[PDB]
């Protein structure tokens, strides 16, 4: 039993809710919140900008030190950093950004990072400003992630479309 509330069950291990991931993280304080990161961990907008804003820019300060030490992530890769006031840990995952021309096949590699964590609160990777089709992202999630994932979808219209079209 866990503290996630109000989710629709899609499969054995995937759950979905119309929610603001920042507010959901603030209430649940999950072990892991996933950020929709880029390779530079520049958290300017979308999910990343909102998560970083909620940490009062502490996420960005920590991320800048990470990059200065380690260099950029790979598209499809991830790193574990602090969850600050939102979660124990933040798993920064880089899905391909279609608006930069990155290969959508890398979306499966991106979701594979979730399998290193037993339970996660997450957005749909490569959705929103990353330019991928969220219905496709949900399909890849369900077919790739085997651990327990709680997906927060900010847009109510999109949430209803994802549910109604789910196979
Ligand atoms: C993850 C998606 C697919 C969907 N959107 C969200 N996802 C998770 N929580 C969210 N709360 C919100 C509040 C207001 C507007 C959007 C959201 C939102 C953001 C979009 C931008 C991005 O690319 O990050 O991507």
Curated annotation (Swiss-Prot):
Q: How does it sit in the membrane?
A: Multi-pass membrane protein
Q: Where in the cell is it found?
A: Host endoplasmic reticulum membrane
Macro domain residues are 1-167
Q: How is its activity regulated?
A: Inhibited in vitro by GRL-0617.
Q: Which reaction does it catalyse?
A: Thiol-dependent hydrolysis of ester, thioester, amide, peptide and isopeptide bonds formed by the C-terminal Gly of ubiquitin (a 76-residue protein attached to proteins as an intracellular targeting signal)
Quaternary structure, per UniProt, is: May form homohexamers. Interacts with N protein.
What role does this protein play?
Responsible for the cleavages located at the N-terminus of the replicase polyprotein. Participates together with nsp4 in the assembly of virally-induced cytoplasmic double-membrane vesicles necessary for viral replication. Antagonizes innate immune induction of type I interferon by blocking the phosphorylation, dimerization and subsequent nuclear translocation of host IRF3. Also prevents host NF-kappa-B signaling. In addition, PL-PRO possesses a deubiquitinating/deISGylating activity and processes both 'Lys-48'- and 'Lys-63'-linked polyubiquitin chains from cellular substrates.
User: What is the protein's given name?
Assistant: Papain-like protease nsp3
Q: What is the lineage of its organism?
A: Viruses, Riboviria, Orthornavirae, Pisuviricota, Pisoniviricetes
Residue span relative to the full protein: 1025 to 1191 of 7096
